[PDB]
Structure formats: structure tokens, C-alpha cells
Design a protein around this ligand. Sequence first.
Ligand SMILES: NC(=O)C1=CN([C@@H]2O[C@H](COP(=O)(O)OP(=O)(O)OC[C@H]3O[C@@H](n4cnc5c(N)ncnc54)[C@H](OP(=O)(O)O)[C@@H]3O)[C@@H](O)[C@H]2O)C=CC1
Ligand SMILES: NC(=O)C1=CN([C@@H]2O[C@H](COP(=O)(O)OP(=O)(O)OC[C@H]3O[C@@H](n4cnc5c(N)ncnc54)[C@H](OP(=O)(O)O)[C@@H]3O)[C@@H](O)[C@H]2O)C=CC1
Ligand SMILES: CC(=O)N(O)CCCP(=O)(O)O
Ligand SMILES: CC(=O)N(O)CCCP(=O)(O)O
Ligand SMILES: [Ca+2]
Ligand SMILES: [Ca+2]
Ligand SMILES: [Mg+2]
Ligand SMILES: [Mg+2]
Lengths: 410, 410
Amino acid sequence: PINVAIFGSTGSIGTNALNIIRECNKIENVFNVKALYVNKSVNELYEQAREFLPEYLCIHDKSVYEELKELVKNIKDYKPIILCGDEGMKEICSSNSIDKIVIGIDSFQGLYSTMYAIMNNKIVALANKESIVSAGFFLKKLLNIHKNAKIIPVDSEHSAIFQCLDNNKVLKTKCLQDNFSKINNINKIFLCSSGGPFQNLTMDELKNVTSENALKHPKWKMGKKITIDSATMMNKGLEVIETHFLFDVDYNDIEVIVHKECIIHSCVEFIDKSVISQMYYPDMQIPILYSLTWPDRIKTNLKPLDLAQVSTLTFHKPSLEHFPCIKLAYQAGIKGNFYPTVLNASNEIANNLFLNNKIKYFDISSIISQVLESFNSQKVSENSEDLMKQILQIHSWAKDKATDIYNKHN
Amino acid sequence: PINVAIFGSTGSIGTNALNIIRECNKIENVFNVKALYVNKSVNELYEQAREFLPEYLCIHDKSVYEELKELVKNIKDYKPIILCGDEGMKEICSSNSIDKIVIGIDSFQGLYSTMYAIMNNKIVALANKESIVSAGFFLKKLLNIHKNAKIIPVDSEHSAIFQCLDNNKVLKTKCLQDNFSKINNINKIFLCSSGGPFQNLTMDELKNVTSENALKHPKWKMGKKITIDSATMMNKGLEVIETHFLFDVDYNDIEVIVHKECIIHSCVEFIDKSVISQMYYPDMQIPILYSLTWPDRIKTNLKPLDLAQVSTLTFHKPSLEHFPCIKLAYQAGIKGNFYPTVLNASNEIANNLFLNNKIKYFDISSIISQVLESFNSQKVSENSEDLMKQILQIHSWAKDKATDIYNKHN
Ligand SMILES: NC(=O)C1=CN([C@@H]2O[C@H](COP(=O)(O)OP(=O)(O)OC[C@H]3O[C@@H](n4cnc5c(N)ncnc54)[C@H](OP(=O)(O)O)[C@@H]3O)[C@@H](O)[C@H]2O)C=CC1
Ligand SMILES: NC(=O)C1=CN([C@@H]2O[C@H](COP(=O)(O)OP(=O)(O)OC[C@H]3O[C@@H](n4cnc5c(N)ncnc54)[C@H](OP(=O)(O)O)[C@@H]3O)[C@@H](O)[C@H]2O)C=CC1
Ligand SMILES: CC(=O)N(O)CCCP(=O)(O)O
Ligand SMILES: CC(=O)N(O)CCCP(=O)(O)O
Ligand SMILES: [Ca+2]
Ligand SMILES: [Ca+2]
Ligand SMILES: [Mg+2]
Ligand SMILES: [Mg+2]
């Protein structure tokens, strides 16, 4: 049995992970849910702990500890180790009876657990794209030091790419490793997007969109932050940088394509021009399960894709005028250095401002752009503890800069 | 370098093979054309000889053997082994100078060179599907005896399938082995078809279509035999049986789908319900090239797939009332034994009868259907040599039968 920890178990990714683990555990003890880790949702965590009876339970916010302890006492035959904060997360990460960790923690915050998972040589099923975008160079360093650690992508497009490749060649390398794409004969990546709710809007219509419209994603049910990133296509911007770091593909060889049916999840063009693509309904259970079974597959009872019923697949190029967040992500990635860190940080601020009705659609890219323009290149630290400190200070600088730019105007 | 023999070098498959070989060699010299083998086309063979200067030349037809040597004398500083008929073919197959053999000979005839290529432990890049359909279980026997021999599918849909797999799983087995689909975690195959030129016709219009209309394929430029088969969709019926043998996929697990754009060449559904497809423009150079480079890929200067430009892909189920040959192949395949031999043989006659305007569209399936019911399941010989003789005898019986049914009605 594979022993799995679910980090951010009460969110969209974490719930999907538990869902598919349940379906796969019908007869055989394929997975063992050893640990659940959330921020604040004690009631929801208690419902999950009742079903999965994990050895470890961790709550980031220490103020709900008593509430957790009190709810858990009602479950009989159950004495879990109940842990708290960063300490509790580090304990679970260092446990010998944990093989694989699903990071479904949102935002920059997800980097702490990713880093600690890697330092303890775990398999990391990483949904959290922010840690890769803002700290790609650093995780590469870490994976170099902790050679048994692996990042297996959960982000649906990156899972799709991973699946399209030949495992005979993927097994001779590692995500984030130099020459990944050369070993895998990758010529270019088609990054597929639903295009989000705003894909058919004119410029003047875009000017007026609000967060409530933005939260109605046509194809994926997700947490609020990634849903807002999908409306602006900053999500796809972030995924361009994620592609570059994970798979070592040049920015000029990453193409964003709007595929509104969201059946094809991304495509790989190899050096002979043959293209391989991965297809399924829009359902995170596949990419989540694959990260946990790779390099094997296991049987599921998920609904089989009916191509005849689907009937039509369409593709077009996205408009960079309507979705300038994509342009900004390419620019930050191409500039290199800590610009992706600045991108991600200033987007976290602008995303949250827009979610809370404090700025308009085009102010998001305007704030991000200004912060990027403000930032001065810094020499990258050679050693890892200092590079991590550098990353934290720049991220934190960029959030405060975005807030100041916001406060100057509105 | 890779030493290649091309069998049927003057046909559609053969001509595209030499083309991709030549083009790829302009980038980096990796292929060497060691042998060319044709039926009757002395002049076209001579023109090809002058370009590629192969070590071996062979012509199947004894009566133009002298004409060939006479033409080949005109070439400066060139002294090749010029061979003749079945013996010349066997000679080339047994040459240690030859690594891989492209079989682009049409019809049942392609079986002879396929079997000698296997007996000599070569990589067989097999385009000819009639040999798999009428002799599948015998080729399977032969590959269990000659353990270093490999069939690498060139037929475009089967190459598509093969390209979608992980080669660390493929290398644990090989094409045409039992359990291939279980080792590769295959659940279902989607076999994509252009639909041919009659895809939109009524039953009434189909009744009166002529071979001239059938030869205008909307997507693939190919030889006459397979083009006629694509019009009736018998090609896809033969391809269902070919899928079953190459990949050990159950007949109830193979789905034919009409994809009129011919961008997606086929799809593989794995046991987790994830689906992987190979995509390219309708161009046989890709599947041919891959058969010669597997398990690697090489750079080409082929036009890159522009998904935005392609814009729409469509998928629907074929009508078995309009294309009854599809039904017949499933029925023959499910029956097993020598029924596929009979299906292939009687189609060879009906196809040719239709090509030459002697019968009407629905007479094709009418004839094949009557030959099939006339056949009786026969005990399968357990030594390879007697099984082969059985196959020839049954194939030959089926052709005489089909001819005799035609003669009755005419
Ligand atoms: N949802 C999706 O389909 C996809 C998500 N992703 C990525 O996955 C990540 C998570 O996304 P999603 O599931 O949608 O987000 P959600 O908002 O649904 O869930 C976030 C989860 O993380 C937990 N969490 C937040 N902070 C902490 C913390 N400090 N310590 C421990 N746990 C914490 C939350 O706990 P609590 O409930 O207590 O607040 C919650 O369980 C994001 O980075 C996103 O980009 C990527 C592709 C698709
Ligand atoms: N064409 C295509 O794109 C595809 C073809 N296939 C399969 O590939 C095979 C070949 O098809 P295609 O190229 O279209 O056929 P063609 O009709 O274009 O050419 C057939 C070739 O085989 C040669 N030939 C015939 N008999 C013999 C023999 N006795 N000994 C040596 N050579 C012989 C012919 O020589 P000669 O010129 O002297 O007559 C010719 O070169 C078929 O089985 C077909 O089903 C499968 C998928 C796609
Ligand atoms: C499922 C997934 O991995 N996402 O990143 C959300 C995709 C949203 P869009 O398809 O880019 O709008
Ligand atoms: C290229 C190929 O492999 N063929 O078998 C001919 C295709 C015929 P259709 O696509 O089924 O009409
Ligand atoms: Ca409290
Ligand atoms: Ca794969
Ligand atoms: Mg994604
Ligand atoms: Mg074919």
C-alpha cells in the first residue's frame, strides 16, 4: 500500500484526491491515507478523519486546535496524533511511513510544505503551481541535493504533458532537471486552455467584469484564487513558467491554445513533428491519481470518454490584448532572475483585490506590470538557505509594492 | 547508421519511405537504403537505383529481369547484386547488412516477405495489413520462435496507437504477443477513419457509385486497392482485426470513429480512463519514419501541425447499414479460426471486381458475406509450415469461391 499525506485536504484538489483514493480502495488496500493537513476547516477535516482515520491530523491555525480535539473525541477506536502549525507539518514530512504527498495548498504558502517534502526525500504530487513559478530555480537546487525526491505534476496540463511523454525516457530524468526536454525529444508544448468565462467578450465588455462573473468558470470547479486566475488567463501565464521549469522547454516553444471544450488537456510536439495529446472530461481525479500511480496506471470506474457524444473539438489563439496577463508572464519568464517571483507575488495581491471588488479587470495586469517594471535584478545566491531567504524577501517586497501601487490610486 | 530495405519501393508506401529517408538524411546522415524490391516497374526501379545506389536490387517478375540489368549498366561506378523473384527476396531478407525492412507490398502477397523478414530476425516495418489479417495467429507463432524479430506497425492508426504507449512497457513484450494490452494497461482503442468519399451518401446513392468516384479519396493519396477499401470502409474493418492481433485488444474493445479531418489518427484509452492520441496532418511519412526510429525519434523538417489553423475536429459513429463491410470484419474477427483469411481473400476479389466496374457497391459485402457463410471452421495445424500451407489453401479457396459467386450472379 502506498502511504499518502494530503496537504490542503479540505479544498478542491484535496477533496478530489480523497474522492479518487476512495474509489480505488474498493477491494484492495491500494492507498493508505496517513495524514491530513488543513488551515482552519475543522468541521470538514473531522468528517474526513472519520472516514479515512489517518494517523496524523494537522491544523495550521493553532486557534482551532481545541475545537478539533473536541470533535475528534467522538470517533471511537481512534487515537490520532493531532499536530499544529509549521512544526506539525515538518513532523509529517519527516515521517518514514509516508511515501507520497499531495500538495493542494493554495498560493505561495504551498512552498513551505513542498520544500520540506523534498528535504525528506518524498514523492511530491504537486498541484500548487505558485511554488514552481516563484521558486523554480530553488526547488531544482533542492532536488539536486535530495536525489530520491521527485516532483510529479498534478496541474492538469502538466499531468497531460507528463502522460504524453514516453516513460522509458521520463524515468531517465526528473521534473526540474536540466535536459529534460532533450531527453524526451520535445520540440514544443501546446498549453491548452478553456479560455475561462470571458473568452467571447469585447475589450469594452472586459472593462466591466466583476469577481462574481469571474467565479463562474465554464468547465472546472476549483478554489477562488485559481478561478480568478482563469478569468484573467493569469493561470495560463503561470502555467507557461511552470512548463519551462518542470520540463526545461524554451519560452519560444510554449504555445497557449484556447480549447473551450476542455477535452484535450495539452499536447506535445516531438522533434519529428508528431504530436501526442491527452484527453479526458474536465476532472482532476485523473491527473491526481496519475501522480500517485506513476509510472503505473490502476483501474478506475470513472466515466469513459465518449468522443462521438463530444462530437466537436475546437482550437484558436488567445488574444493578448484581451488577456495581457499572459504577455506579462512570458516577459517575466524570459527576463528570468526573480521576475517570476515578482509576477506571482504581485498577482496574489491583484487577484485578491479584484476578488474583493477593489479594482477592475485591467487594473490587475496594470498593477502586476508596474511591480515588474519596479523590480531590479539581483544576483542569485549560490547556497540554498540564502536563496530561500532571498526568495522570501523579494516575494514579500513585491506584495507590499503591489499594495502601495493600489493604495496610491484607489 | 540504419540499414534499410524497402519492399514495394515504387508504390505509395515505398515512395513516401524513400522521401522521408532522403529528407531526414539532409539534416543528419542516419539512414542507408540497402535494397529495393518491386514487382514489374523496371524503369521506376532503375530511376530509384540511380538516386539511392543500393547494394541489392530485386524484381519479382522474371520477364523484366534482363531489362533491369540492361538499364542498370548505364550507371557509373555502380555494381549491385541484381536479383529475381522469391529467391532474390529471401536473399535480401537473409543479408546481415540489413537491419530493418519496410514492407509496402500490397495484398496477401505481402505475407511472403513479412514471414521471411521475421524468420531472419529483422525489424519489420509493416504497412501491409492483409498479412496480419489473413495470417495474424501464424505471424504470432513465428515471432515466438524468432525472438529477436519485431513487427513495428506502419499502418497509420496502429502507428498512432504504438506512439501513445510507454516504451518501458512495450519493451517487456512486442506487437502480436498475447497479453500486450494487459502489459500496456490498454482498455479500449478508438480507430479513427476519414470516412472515405461516400461518408455523406444515402443508401440510394451508394447503390450506384462507381469505382471512379471511389478512387477520389478526400485525405490520403494511396494505391488503388486500399483506396477502394477506404470507400467501402473495409479498410477499417481489416484494421479492427489488425488491432486485435497487433495489440491483443478484444473486439468489443475496439471502436471505429469517423474523424473527417484526419488529424487524430487514433486514440488509446487506458485502464484509469485517461485517453492518449497521436496527431498529425494526413501524411504517411510520420508513421513510416517512427517505425524506422523506434524506440527513439529524430529531427525532421516536416511542416509543424498548426492546431489553430486546423481549428475544428469532428467525431461521429459510422453507419453499419451504409458500410456493411465493417460489420462483416467484426463478425469474421469474432468467429476467429481462418475466417479473417476468408474475409481478406474474398474482399481481394470483390474489391477488384468493383475496381473494374463488374459489380455494384452493395455486391461487395454481398459476395464476402456468402463466402464467409460457405466456409467451415477448420482444425488449426500446430507446426508453422503446415499452418502456412493451410492459410494459402484457404485464401486461394476463398478467392475461387468469391469468383464463383460473382459468376453465378453474372
Ligand atoms: N482546484 C483545482 O482543480 C486545481 C488546483 N490547482 C492548484 O492547487 C492549489 C490548491 O488549489 P484549490 O484546491 O483549488 O484551492 P482551495 O481554495 O480549494 O483549497 C486550499 C486548501 O489549502 C488549505 N490551506 C490554505 N492555507 C494552508 C496552510 N497555511 N496550511 C495548511 N493548509 C492550508 C486550505 O485549508 P482550509 O480549508 O482550512 O482553508 C484548503 O484545504 C493551488 O495552488 C492551485 O493552483 C492546480 C490545478 C487545478
Ligand atoms: N498507401 C498508403 O498510404 C497505406 C498503405 N497501407 C498498406 O501498404 C501496402 C501497400 O500499399 P500501397 O503503397 O498503397 O500500394 P501500391 O499499390 O501503391 O504499391 C504496391 C507496391 O508493391 C509492389 N509489389 C506488388 N507485388 C509485389 C511482389 N510480388 N513483390 C515485390 N513487390 C510487389 C508494387 O510494385 P510495382 O510498382 O512493380 O507494381 C508496388 O511497389 C498495402 O498492404 C496497404 O494496405 C497501409 C496504410 C497506408
Ligand atoms: C484544471 C487546471 O489545471 N487548471 O489550471 C484550471 C484550468 C483553467 P483554464 O482551462 O486555463 O481556464
Ligand atoms: C492512412 C491509413 O492508414 N489508411 O489505412 C488509409 C486511411 C483510410 P480512412 O482514413 O479510413 O478513410
Ligand atoms: Ca478556538
Ligand atoms: Ca506516456
Ligand atoms: Mg492547470
Ligand atoms: Mg490505416
